[PDB]
Each structure stands twice: as structure tokens, then as C-alpha cells.
Amino acid sequence: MLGILNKMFDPTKRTLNRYEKIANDIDAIRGDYENLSDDALKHKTIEFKERLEKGATTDDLLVEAFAVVREASRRVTGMFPFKVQLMGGVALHDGNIAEMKTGEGKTLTSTLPVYLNALTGKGVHVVTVNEYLASRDAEQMGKIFEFLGLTVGLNLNSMSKDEKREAYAADITYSTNNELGFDYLRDNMVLYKEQMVQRPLHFAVIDEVDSILIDEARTPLIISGQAAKSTKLYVQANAFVRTLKAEKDYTYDIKTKAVQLTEEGMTKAEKAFGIDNLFDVKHVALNHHINQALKAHVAMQKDVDYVVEDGQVVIVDSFTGRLMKGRRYSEGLHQAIEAKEGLEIQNESMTLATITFQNYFRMYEKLAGMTGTAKTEEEEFRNIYNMQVVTIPTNRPVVRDDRPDLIYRTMEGKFKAVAEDVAQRYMTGQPVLVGTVAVETSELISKLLKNKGIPHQVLNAKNHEREAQIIEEAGQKGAVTIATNMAGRGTDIKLGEGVKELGGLAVVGTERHESRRIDNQLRGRSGRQGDPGITQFYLSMEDELMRRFGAERTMAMLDRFGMDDSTPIQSKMVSRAVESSQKRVEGNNFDSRKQLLQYDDVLRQQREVIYKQRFEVIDSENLREIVENMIKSSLERAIAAYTPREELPEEWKLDGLVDLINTTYLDEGALEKSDIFGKEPDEMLELIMDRIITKYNEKEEQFGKEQMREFEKVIVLRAVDSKWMDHIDAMDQLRQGIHLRAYAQTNPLREYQMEGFAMFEHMIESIEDEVAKFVMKAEIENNLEREEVVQGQTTAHQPQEG
Amino acid sequence: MLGILNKMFDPTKRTLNRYEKIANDIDAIRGDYENLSDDALKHKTIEFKERLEKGATTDDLLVEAFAVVREASRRVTGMFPFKVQLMGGVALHDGNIAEMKTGEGKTLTSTLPVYLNALTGKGVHVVTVNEYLASRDAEQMGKIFEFLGLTVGLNLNSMSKDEKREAYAADITYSTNNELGFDYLRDNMVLYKEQMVQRPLHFAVIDEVDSILIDEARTPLIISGQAAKSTKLYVQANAFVRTLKAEKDYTYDIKTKAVQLTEEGMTKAEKAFGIDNLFDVKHVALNHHINQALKAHVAMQKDVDYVVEDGQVVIVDSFTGRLMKGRRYSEGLHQAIEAKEGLEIQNESMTLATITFQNYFRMYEKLAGMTGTAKTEEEEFRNIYNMQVVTIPTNRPVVRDDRPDLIYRTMEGKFKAVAEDVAQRYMTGQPVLVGTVAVETSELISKLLKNKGIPHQVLNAKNHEREAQIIEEAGQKGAVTIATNMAGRGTDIKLGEGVKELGGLAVVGTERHESRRIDNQLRGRSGRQGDPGITQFYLSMEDELMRRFGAERTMAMLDRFGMDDSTPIQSKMVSRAVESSQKRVEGNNFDSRKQLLQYDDVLRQQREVIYKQRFEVIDSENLREIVENMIKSSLERAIAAYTPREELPEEWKLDGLVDLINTTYLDEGALEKSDIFGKEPDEMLELIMDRIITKYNEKEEQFGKEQMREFEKVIVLRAVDSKWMDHIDAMDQLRQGIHLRAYAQTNPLREYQMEGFAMFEHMIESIEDEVAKFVMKAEIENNLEREEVVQGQTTAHQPQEG
């Protein structure tokens, strides 16, 4: 720009120059490889790999690296990258978004940085919107990479875990956004390490980021799994439980523990015919429902903790006495209560795992992406991904004619106009392309065309290969192509035979989309590098975009001023009002994504601890140390509840504690009055922990010295996985229940944070506790084999924008 | 922590270790300086300065640097910093928040990093909440810095611009948050460079960040200036204007220009007795109101552009036809219209400049801060300032007794209880401190004390010196001190003579504050490094904190369960409900700050361009180049309006354009039909610009070859400053008008963004335009002296939370 205002381009002007000097350094040495041999060239990679091992940086080798690649492509494809393509490659390397207008060779450009980053062998995921472009690029682009001696994998959902492990093994992997994600998810549900298919997330070059990081990021990736109609269990448990009432089934006050352990309920229990006394089989599974419906009666009173209703069982906020929006009790206790109060026990499907693209891609050591339309959403890339948009220069000056939107007062009038323009160009040999926005809009015009007798093709996005075919020849003389929302994005339309003189392509936008970015992509399709073209947009006062801006007043000045008469109009002021309309929409959607991410941030911080721990567990040569560590933490919690805020030291009720530990961590008479006496809550922990150590040792030599290792692993996993999947479901439930009754003037998010976290802390205590109770008092029988907690089949999906 | 949950401390655990190894490297070489000479030691600085010049990094010299300092302090103060103080110093250096509990020597600790960062001579601002602690620290801490041979400045508002320039000159500057800010503001309003008092913002070590970056950051820094009852002008202009109606006072259609230039209104104009024809005096000032009320009549029609009302003149959104919330017309055009439609012309005070602390401190190359309470607001520091809170270990294990809040059913009952506890300890020699939260609460207890005959002192924050005195002896035997919201924060209470055996201090919190952080600071006051203490908090069901949580239900279980009977209660569950109460509040306030910043972000991006340009102008040896550049941009805009979206090339209306330029940039017959003909809008710009060049040259040799330089500077400033101050006011107006009628489902912020920006673009065009019109057709008379645009006196302030 000219004048004062030119400074909003200074940080972009200083950067784009680093990049111009650099691309010049790269062109400077075309000679250094130009005349060389194919094999001398491949040795470069090795030379670099070594050079790096010795201590160089990807940045140092950048120029040469790009040179080598620049060379490799000409040899392999016959294209020697332009100085602009070089500039883009660098942007990508620097971790930014390469905004390189449609037709600049983004595919090829990706190779430069892809290669340079791959060298370390850390891996590089090149990502795309669909399985077609993935395979296409991996094939075409693989040749260049392979030629310079690099492995190239392709990930598809149609591949075995083994096939995937293979593809991720490569120095470079191509795949869809969805595939990547789901794998990362499945990857953290795995029972044995070797089942994971992914390698630590290094660097992702996202092809068409706008579509990926923005469009397909309005919702999250979820993984569901239904519950096996298990109602018979709960009801049964519920029923049985209310039999054993006695102090010979121990409850708690200072703790809230329904201890079944009594031979009344340990005998009268197996009387429910629990295949006798199988503890590791049953106790893990069955004994879990007992202890639930056991507590459901004893610890959870009707109108003090919860409330019954025609809308099921609700919780009550103590101290406020409110109805906890969308919150349930952990570990199926909610269902046990429903059974105790006879209510319909809901057996819905669970969300076993979730992450949002935002949080996913944010996970790589480095991210970069490319596209022809991005400056539009720069605030978002800078905000959410810390990626600055760099608008790369065009190879050849753009010379396409972009036409100001023509306004109409009616749809059918508008449409009929679109249909004529098509004809005009068709009756000239010019190839036209019309962009609709909805399936209906496309067939409409199609029929308008067949009536008028104009040969055409229609794209309604199905098996992208077939359309990609159609679209490439969509630039010939008899070209008349109809695109429903850019159906063939990625495949470029090259200027037809003899078509040059007929003008350019001339695209026709039937209407305008919510996002400029998109109708700007439509524009993009013509002028492929200095080519001529005409981009005409058509608009009507009755378009949804219009009748959503609150533009009735204007639909009236038209009418009231006899305007629908002169019909074809071009008011800078109405068009500027369209853009603002678009800006408002885009922003609303941004606000949406911002909120989605925010809610998932509570989850990410939680995933961090769980995912990291779960992994830690699955690599356990020396597991026990954690176990004891968790048992010590579990134990300390007891001691603390029994030695509250200084409430008279050795007058703490040092007997119930004794009785508890005794029958919680050990087996009856083990710990007694005397032992724990006149000692700080601290001293006690060690003494008492020491006997848990002692007993643990005893267990290592009496039931299998190293099977214990996997026993540990088995249990710690059963625990972890069961508690977590549950919580996550509870969290996905709450995230969408909390938005119901929130007069607290607090932004609901904070509630989800606080409640979400609270819950989490509980779960940890549960895990830590379950682990401790089992690693002590549980008994082995046949096979100590790790077992899946997911019941039946799973389902990996992304929800439609709701 | 123990068990699974311990991982939320991993990134803090990995960092705090870097810091422990380091403090050990520093203690390792105590010998290398221990026995050395005072002068050999000061040479270290030089040695370092040189070492750095040669190419070292502050990080390399860190250990030694800290060593030298460690040494310098013992010599100068008699305190050899502990390993924890060393750890904190590093945190600060690394750009984080040092959370070092009250009584750990944060003051001293600051010296280590302060020094190491000062070396480059780039400067280091050490900041505080009040003028007292500033001077205090600069005095006490200056000695160490000066001793190692460094200059130390102290900034106060009581200092001349010369005195301030002096203080900022130092290698280190101490001052208040407010002072810093306002100076930065005033600094960008300066007429001549040498008037600025600040040096490029290098590094700021914020003492008590929580209070600074959070508490005192709920509102922004504003600078007001009233308008000199100038109503007579406008009315007059308005009046006069409607006389000259003719086509001999030229208006515009394709442009919207009321061109006074006609000798009708250039003669009949000076007839208003404009001291004849003084153009640079009058034209800049007076001719500005004419051209306003001139356009007010011709270009702005009543119910098409705006609307009259009992609430004054409003604008209308075209295309939507809505009432633009809180928006005014630029450059006083709003006032000219009011005069044309006779309405009350408002002459309010203007906001000449603004910035928020958030955006201010975010401006340093590096920021760091220290305090005893920060982990509370970690999410905010990490969010807004990218500063992670590092909780530094305590020198000696903490052994103070923190007591669980005691609950009461009544205030007067509660208070009476506070008054007795005081007595109990007083009747023991223990020194007690009671923290109130409001002025009223403090006198209340004061009277409760005098009645009960207990000698005490009360602090109600006034001339901090006097209180700082009181507070230090507040740890002696007969100590009984009353603090209204931590009145003496910073000065530490050392454990009284013989007081050790009497227990500790024993603080008593009369109530709890909105933020834990604060009642946690209250707690902080005792246990000063392994000292004993008792922190008792007192609470009542009728405290504002309570009767704001929606806790009436609970005020009823008490009553309904005969609870106000046993009165002194300790329910973990009600106390946990207090904290959550606090958490909600803190968050609401955070949400507040987040919104404040967000709105100012639209302003910052704008400040960037203006502030940077304005500066660029005030360093103008070679100004003209920008000028022409802005004239060329101004001119291009005409040409574009006269050659719209391809509307029939040489059928553009190439005559009105001619007529315009002719009488806008040049002086009548200069440019004509022929000249501009058959040329692209591009070609035209150059030709026509060339004649502006030609004429500009002519002006450089006919009115003073180098006075022109300052003429340029003069005008470019008049323009810039007038347009900007206005806009800013308009922006501060809108930011608080937009929150009125916004059913657009859009978050209002986006509107402010879009409208805010729109306005800005206009202003630039105005500046660029005004500059161009003057640098051509304006005439010099006596003195071409830069002149202030601020009328009368100014006022620098921060608004109370509204």
C-alpha cells in the first residue's frame, strides 16, 4: 500500500525479504548440482545426515538442501522450482503458513521443507483432507523423495495396525487429518506398547490448512463404544446387597466405605453363585457392582446427596443445595442408585476417547501448512497455532479479471442470468466453471442448462478421483463444469488447447459463501500463473446470506425505489455489506472453535497425566515402585482422614483407623492400638507402609516372582483404563449438560473447569485406591493376562456441526 | 504429592532442578571472590561488560555474575544470599515469576538478575506499587548496585522531564507502575524527540506482580484534556457557511468534497474577519471548522446519513438502517451537524491517550516479577504475559500453624470473638495482627479494643512510610496491630525480643477476601523463615462473601438445625465452599481483564502504526520522501474514485477528475482533458504525481529551502496529532457505547474491531489528505514552529473499577 497505512505490512515485509535473499542463495548454486550424477546427488542426503549428526542445524543445510531438492525434481519431474516456490518452502520450514495462491505448485514446494526436516529420521507427516490426494501426492511426490533416498509411507484407514506401523516408520508419511488423529487416539488405548502405530509427533506439513485446521475443526474426534445390555447385573447387585445389612458388612463415617469383606457378605455373597471365590475374575468385574450398590444404600441417602426425578437421578450441590446441571456419579454408582430407587437404568454408548484437531496438531514439535487462501483467517492461525501467515509472491503477475458482484432482486431471475452467461461463453469456446454452494443449486442450474442445450459436467463430491478427472479437462474449449463447493480443490485446471485467445476460463459464482476464503478459492481457479480470466459473482436479495444480515430494509429501498426494474446492479456499498456479513459469520465460527478448544484444554491437561502415566505403565520392567508409591499415597489418605485438622492428637480415634487399615490394606489383626500410638500422622505412614512393603514382599515369593510384574501391570491397567474411559464419558456428558441452568453469573466454562477437575482428582484417588486394594488382598487363579476394558466394538467418528 | 497426580508438577520439577544445580555452581565458587578486594571485585563488572561485548551471553556470565553480587551484598549489607534466593534470581532471569514466600528476601534476590541484565547498558526498570518502596529499595539496593559500579535512577511524578530523563539514563531505574506507564504515554505526545524521557523498554523486574499485573490492572491508564469552551466557533462557522451556497463553492458526488477554495467563500470568508488571509494560522485552525460545517450541510443529509434526537445526533448503518450504538463522526463533523440542526453541542473532555498495563508491560524485551502469592493466578500469568510461575523453595522449612476458618452465625458475634482472641494473646505477650478488609471493619474492632483496654495500632494505608514504621515493630511483645487490607506489605515484621517463646505472631483474619491470594498474604506475615505462628481466620454466615455465594440454604440448616447455638464451627465442607466462592470471583475478574485487554488490542495495533509513524516524523532530516509518499497515496485515491470498477475506460468522467486535482493538489488550470487521456489509472498517477513533484520543488526554492523541512514536520504533526487524539477519544467513546443495542448475535467485540478499524482507515486517509492539501496550497507568514494540539491542561489518571 501507499501512505501511512503501509506499516501493517512491516513484520511481513522484513520476513519475506529474509526469504528472497535466501531463494537467491539457492539459485546461486544451481551450478553446484546442475551438472552432477544421479548417484552423486543422492549421496548428498547422506552427506547431510552426517553433517547434521556432527552438529549442524536444519537451518544451516537449508540452502544446499533446497538446492539438491530443486535439482532432484527437475530430474524426476521436469520442474525446476521457481524462486517463489523456494520462498514458500522456507516459510514452511520456519513453521508458518505458506499462502501461495492456487496454481503456484504447493505440492512441489512441500518437498523442499519436507525433505530438510525428514533427515534427522524423526519423521514428517504431510497431511491432507482426503485419501485420494494423499495417495496421489505420495505417489507423485514420493518419487522425488525416494530418489534422494528417503522412505515414504502412506496411511489409510483400510490398513492393518501392522501396515500402519509400517507407514509411520518411513522418513515421511502422507495421510488424512482424520487418520492421524484417530490413530493417536487408538494409540493411547493400546494394551501392549508394540500395538501403537505412531511415532513421536515431529513435524506436520498441512496441505490446505484452512480446510483442515479451520473448516474440519468445528467439532472433535470422538471414539464411542456401547455397553453390553448389562442391566441384569446392576439390578441383581442392587437386590442382593439389601440382605446383608449388619455391622458385619462394615461402613464408614470419617471415610464413606462399604466394606463387603465380611464372611457374611463374602460367603452369603458367593451364594449369588459367583463360581465360588474367584477373586481376580469376579472381584475385578462382579465385586465392582456389589461395592457400588453396597455404597448406593449405605452412603448415598435419597434427598441429601441426590434427588429422584422423572428425569432420572440428580446430584445436589451441598451448601448451595442446587441441582447439578449435567453431572453423574463416577464408576456406575449413578446406575446403582437408579436401581436402588428403581428408576430406568440408562445404558447409553460411551465416549471412550476424544481430542480436538486444535489440540492434536498443537502436539507436534513443529507445524506448518500451505494453501491459496489464508490471510482471511490470519488472526486465528496466529492465535490458536502460533503460525503467522506469509503471503508468498506470485511467479507471474496476476492478470485475471475479478468482477464486482452483480445484484438481483430474485433468485430465479439471478439463476436464469447465470444460465445465460454460461451460454454466451459456451457460444464462444471459452470454458466456464460455475460454483454453487449447495447440492440443490447445482442440479437447478444443471436442468437450466440441459433445457438450454449446453453440454456440461457436474461435481457433487464423491470418489474424488473421478471428479479430479473431470475437473482437469474442465479448462478445454467445450468446458462447462459445475462445482458444488469447490468439489475438485487441489487438482489444477490447465488452460485448454487454443483456449488462450478465447480469453481465460471465466468462472461464475452462483452465490457467495459464508466465508470469503471459500468464494476466494472459487476465484482462485482461473489465472493459473499469469493466465487471463473473468471471475463473475452473482447475488440476489433473497439469498440466505442476505436474509440473515438483517437486510430487509434494503430489500425495501429496492422495491420502494422501483429498483428490481434495472435489476443488474453493482453497488460497492451493498457488496461491502456482504463482506462484513461474511466477516461476522466467520468470526462467530471462530468464537465457536475458540470455545471448543477451551473446553478441551481442561481435558488435555488431564490427558497429559493419564496418557503419560498409562504409557509409563506399559513400559514397566520395574513397575512395583510406582505401585508402592500409589499404595503409599492411598494409605496416607486414610491416615489423614483419621487424624484431621489437629483434632486432639492421640485422641484422633486411633482405633477405627486401625480397624480400617487392618481390613483395607492388610488382613485383620495386623495393626493395633499400641503400634500406632503417640506418633505424628507422618511417623505412622512409614511404619504402616513398611508392613505393606513386608506383606508385598511376601506376595512376590509366594505367588510367582515375575508374574507379579505383569500382575502389577495387569491391575494398574484394569484400574486406569476403567476409571478413565468412564470419566472421559462423564466429561463429554458434563461439557454438554453444564450449559443448562447457570445463573451463577459465572461463565459456565469455569464451572466445567472446577467440576471437571474435582472429578478428576476423585478418579485418581479411585485408581490409586483400587490398585492398592488389589495388589494386596486379590488372588490369582489361571492366566494373568492383560485384558481389554472396551466392550464389544468401537466406533471412531467426528460429529456433524451441532 | 504422592501417587499418579504428581505429574502436574513435572514441568516445574524439571525447571526447579536446573535452578538447584545452578545455585550450587554459584556456591561452588564462593572462594573465587570471597577473599578478594573491594576494587578487584568492582572490576568484575568491567570484565563482564567486556566479556559480553566480545560475544558472551547473559546466561554464560550468570554464575559468576551471581557470585560477584552474592559477594557484593555481604560486604555491603552483611547478607550472603541463600541458595533459594539464588534460585529465585535465576527464575527472574529466565523471565518467570519468582514465587518466594513472604520473608525470603525478594528485594535482595532482585539484585542478582537486575545486575546481570543491566550490564549491556540497555537499562532495567525495577517496578513497585508505591513511591515509598521505590525510593526505599533504590536506596538500600542501590548501594549494592553502585558498589559494583552501576548507575541507579529513581523515577517519581514529582520530577521534571529533565530529572526523569536523568533517572531513565541509569543502568537501573526504580519506579511505580503508574509512573512508567504515564511516561510512556506522555512520551508519544512529545513535540521534539529530546522531550522524551524514556529509553527503549528493555527488561522489567516487577516487585509484587500480583498486585501490579493483576490487582492494579483492572482498568487502563487514560490521559484527559478538556476542550476550551470553543462553542462560539462552530455556531459561527455553521451560520456563515449557509450563505455561500452556489456552485461557486464546489461539492462532490463521486467524492463528497465541499471545496471552499472559491473566491466567493475565500473572500466572503475572510469577511468573517479572519485577520485577512492568514492561511497557516487560520486555515489550519479556523478553515477546519468551515470545511466541517460546509460538508455538514452539503454532504450530510438529515434522515439518510444520521438522525436527530433528544439524545443528540446519531448515525445510521446504511443497508441495515440501524442506529449506530455509540459512534460519532470524525474531526468534529458531529459537532458541526448538531449546530446545523441546532442541537446542544457537547463539549466534553477528551481521552488524549490510553494503554493498559497488560499491553504496557507486554512491551518489554523481557519481563519478570516476584511475590509471595502467585501460584493462585498462574493461569493468568501464563496466559497474558507468557510468564510461568516458579514456586521457589523455602530457606527453612515452614512451621507456622494455619488454622481452619472458624464459622459464626452473626457478625457482631464473630467480631466480639476476634476481640477476645486478641486479648488472650495480649494477656500473654504474643504480638497479634488482625487483618480487616474494609476501613469500617478496622475502626469497629479498634473501638472493641479500646473498650476492652488493649493498646494497639491501626493502619489505614496513608503515607506508607509512617505505617511501614508501625508494622516493623508490630512483632514485639506488646504488639497488637490492625491492618486494613495488608496496609504494610513489603516491610517485614521480624520476631520480637523474647517473643520467640511466646509462640509466634498469631495473625487473625477478621474475614476473608475475594481472593485467596490476599488472605494468603495475610497468612504470609508470620513464620518469617522457620518462625512459629498461628494464623486464625474468622468467618460469619452474614459476611458479604457468604451472602453472595447464594448460601441462604445453608444459613437455614444452621438455623433449622439449632446450629447458631454451638456457634464456633469448622466444617471442611463450608470452608471448601468459601474457596470455590473465591475461585469464582477471581475468575470473573480475570474474565474482566481478559476483555479489557482484548478491546485494547484493537488499539495497540493502531498505536503501533501511529506511534511508529509519529516517531518516524520527529526524526526527520529527510521528511519530504514520506510526505510525497503520502501525497501520492492521497492522489491515487482520487484517480481511483474517478476511474471505478472498469466503468468504461476513457468514459470515466475524465473531466471532473481534472477539475478536481486541478483545484485540490494544484491551482486551477494545470491539468486538463488532453493530458489525462487514453491512459490507465496507473499511468495517470505518475504523470500527475510528477507535476506535484515539479510544484513541490518550486515551493522548496521560493519559500525557504530548509525551513521546508520543518514546515513538512510541522504540518505532518498538526495533522497526525489532531486526527489521532480525536480518534482515540472516539475509540474510548465507542468501546463504551457499543455495549448498547447489539442483537446482531455477534459478540460486540467483533463490532468494535470492525468499526474501530474502519474508522482508523478513515483517519489515515484524512491525515494523508490534510498533509497533501497543506504541503501544496498553504502559505507561510511568520514562525514555522511546531505547535501543541493539546488545549490547556492535561490530566493523567487511572479510573476506579467501573
CSV table of N, CA and C in Angstrom, one decimal, chain B residues 733-778:
chain,number,residue,atom,x,y,z
B,733,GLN,N,-14.8,6.3,23.4
B,733,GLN,CA,-16.2,6.5,23.5
B,733,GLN,C,-16.9,5.2,23.0
B,734,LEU,N,-16.7,4.8,21.8
B,734,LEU,CA,-17.2,3.6,21.2
B,734,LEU,C,-17.1,2.4,22.0
B,735,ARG,N,-15.9,2.2,22.6
B,735,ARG,CA,-15.6,1.0,23.4
B,735,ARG,C,-16.6,0.9,24.5
B,736,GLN,N,-17.3,2.0,24.8
B,736,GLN,CA,-18.3,2.0,25.9
B,736,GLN,C,-19.6,2.5,25.4
B,737,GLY,N,-19.9,2.4,24.1
B,737,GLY,CA,-21.2,2.8,23.6
B,737,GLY,C,-21.8,1.6,22.9
B,738,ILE,N,-20.8,0.9,22.3
B,738,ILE,CA,-21.1,-0.3,21.5
B,738,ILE,C,-21.9,-1.4,22.4
B,739,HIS,N,-21.7,-1.3,23.7
B,739,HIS,CA,-22.3,-2.2,24.6
B,739,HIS,C,-23.7,-1.8,24.8
B,740,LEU,N,-24.3,-1.2,23.8
B,740,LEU,CA,-25.7,-0.7,23.8
B,740,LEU,C,-26.4,-1.0,22.5
B,741,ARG,N,-27.3,-2.0,22.6
B,741,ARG,CA,-28.1,-2.5,21.4
B,741,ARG,C,-27.1,-3.2,20.5
B,742,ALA,N,-27.1,-4.6,20.6
B,742,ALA,CA,-26.3,-5.5,19.8
B,742,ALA,C,-26.9,-6.8,19.7
B,743,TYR,N,-28.1,-6.8,19.1
B,743,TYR,CA,-28.8,-8.1,18.9
B,743,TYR,C,-28.2,-8.9,17.7
B,744,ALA,N,-27.2,-8.3,17.0
B,744,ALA,CA,-26.5,-9.0,15.9
B,744,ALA,C,-26.0,-10.4,16.2
B,745,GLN,N,-26.2,-10.9,17.4
B,745,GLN,CA,-25.8,-12.3,17.8
B,745,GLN,C,-24.3,-12.3,17.8
B,746,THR,N,-23.6,-11.3,17.3
B,746,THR,CA,-22.2,-11.2,17.2
B,746,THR,C,-21.8,-10.7,18.6
B,747,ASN,N,-20.6,-11.2,18.9
B,747,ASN,CA,-20.0,-10.7,20.2
B,747,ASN,C,-19.6,-9.3,19.8
B,748,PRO,N,-20.1,-8.3,20.6
B,748,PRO,CA,-19.8,-6.9,20.5
B,748,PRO,C,-18.4,-6.5,20.2
B,749,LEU,N,-17.5,-7.3,20.7
B,749,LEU,CA,-16.1,-7.1,20.5
B,749,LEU,C,-15.8,-7.0,19.0
B,750,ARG,N,-16.3,-8.0,18.2
B,750,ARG,CA,-16.0,-8.0,16.8
B,750,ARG,C,-16.5,-6.7,16.1
B,751,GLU,N,-17.6,-6.2,16.6
B,751,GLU,CA,-18.2,-4.9,16.1
B,751,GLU,C,-17.2,-3.8,16.3
B,752,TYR,N,-16.7,-3.7,17.5
B,752,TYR,CA,-15.7,-2.7,17.9
B,752,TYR,C,-14.5,-2.9,17.0
B,753,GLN,N,-14.1,-4.1,16.8
B,753,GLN,CA,-12.9,-4.4,15.9
B,753,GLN,C,-13.2,-3.8,14.5
B,754,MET,N,-14.3,-4.3,13.9
B,754,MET,CA,-14.6,-3.9,12.5
B,754,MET,C,-14.9,-2.4,12.4
B,755,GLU,N,-15.6,-1.8,13.3
B,755,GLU,CA,-16.0,-0.4,13.2
B,755,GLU,C,-14.7,0.4,13.6
B,756,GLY,N,-14.1,0.0,14.7
B,756,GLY,CA,-12.8,0.6,15.2
B,756,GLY,C,-11.8,0.7,14.0
B,757,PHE,N,-11.6,-0.4,13.3
B,757,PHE,CA,-10.7,-0.4,12.2
B,757,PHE,C,-11.1,0.5,11.1
B,758,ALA,N,-12.4,0.4,10.7
B,758,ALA,CA,-13.0,1.2,9.6
B,758,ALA,C,-12.6,2.7,9.8
B,759,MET,N,-12.9,3.1,11.1
B,759,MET,CA,-12.6,4.5,11.5
B,759,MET,C,-11.2,4.8,11.3
B,760,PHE,N,-10.3,3.9,11.7
B,760,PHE,CA,-8.9,4.1,11.6
B,760,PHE,C,-8.5,4.3,10.2
B,761,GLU,N,-9.0,3.5,9.3
B,761,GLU,CA,-8.6,3.6,7.9
B,761,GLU,C,-9.0,5.0,7.5
B,762,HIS,N,-10.2,5.5,7.9
B,762,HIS,CA,-10.6,6.8,7.5
B,762,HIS,C,-9.6,7.8,8.0
B,763,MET,N,-9.3,7.8,9.3
B,763,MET,CA,-8.4,8.8,9.8
B,763,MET,C,-7.1,8.8,9.0
B,764,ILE,N,-6.5,7.7,8.6
B,764,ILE,CA,-5.3,7.7,7.8
B,764,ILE,C,-5.5,8.4,6.5
B,765,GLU,N,-6.6,8.2,5.9
B,765,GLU,CA,-6.9,8.8,4.6
B,765,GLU,C,-7.0,10.3,4.9
B,766,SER,N,-7.6,10.7,6.1
B,766,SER,CA,-7.7,12.1,6.4
B,766,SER,C,-6.3,12.7,6.6
B,767,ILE,N,-5.5,12.2,7.5
B,767,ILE,CA,-4.2,12.6,7.7
B,767,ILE,C,-3.5,12.8,6.3
B,768,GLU,N,-3.3,11.7,5.6
B,768,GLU,CA,-2.7,11.7,4.3
B,768,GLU,C,-3.2,12.8,3.4
B,769,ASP,N,-4.5,13.1,3.5
B,769,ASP,CA,-5.2,14.1,2.7
B,769,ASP,C,-4.8,15.5,3.2
B,770,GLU,N,-5.0,15.7,4.5
B,770,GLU,CA,-4.7,17.0,5.1
B,770,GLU,C,-3.3,17.4,4.8
B,771,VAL,N,-2.4,16.5,5.1
B,771,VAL,CA,-1.0,16.7,4.8
B,771,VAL,C,-0.8,17.2,3.4
B,772,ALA,N,-1.3,16.5,2.4
B,772,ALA,CA,-1.2,16.8,1.0
B,772,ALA,C,-1.8,18.2,0.6
B,773,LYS,N,-3.0,18.5,1.1
B,773,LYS,CA,-3.6,19.8,0.8
B,773,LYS,C,-2.8,21.0,1.3
B,774,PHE,N,-2.1,20.8,2.5
B,774,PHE,CA,-1.3,21.9,3.1
B,774,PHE,C,0.0,22.0,2.4
B,775,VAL,N,0.8,20.9,2.3
B,775,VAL,CA,2.1,21.0,1.8
B,775,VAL,C,2.1,21.6,0.3
B,776,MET,N,0.9,21.8,-0.2
B,776,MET,CA,0.8,22.3,-1.6
B,776,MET,C,0.4,23.8,-1.5
B,777,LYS,N,-1.0,23.9,-1.4
B,777,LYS,CA,-1.6,25.2,-1.4
B,777,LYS,C,-1.6,26.1,-0.1
B,778,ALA,N,-0.8,25.7,0.9
B,778,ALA,CA,-0.8,26.5,2.2
B,778,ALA,C,0.3,27.5,2.1
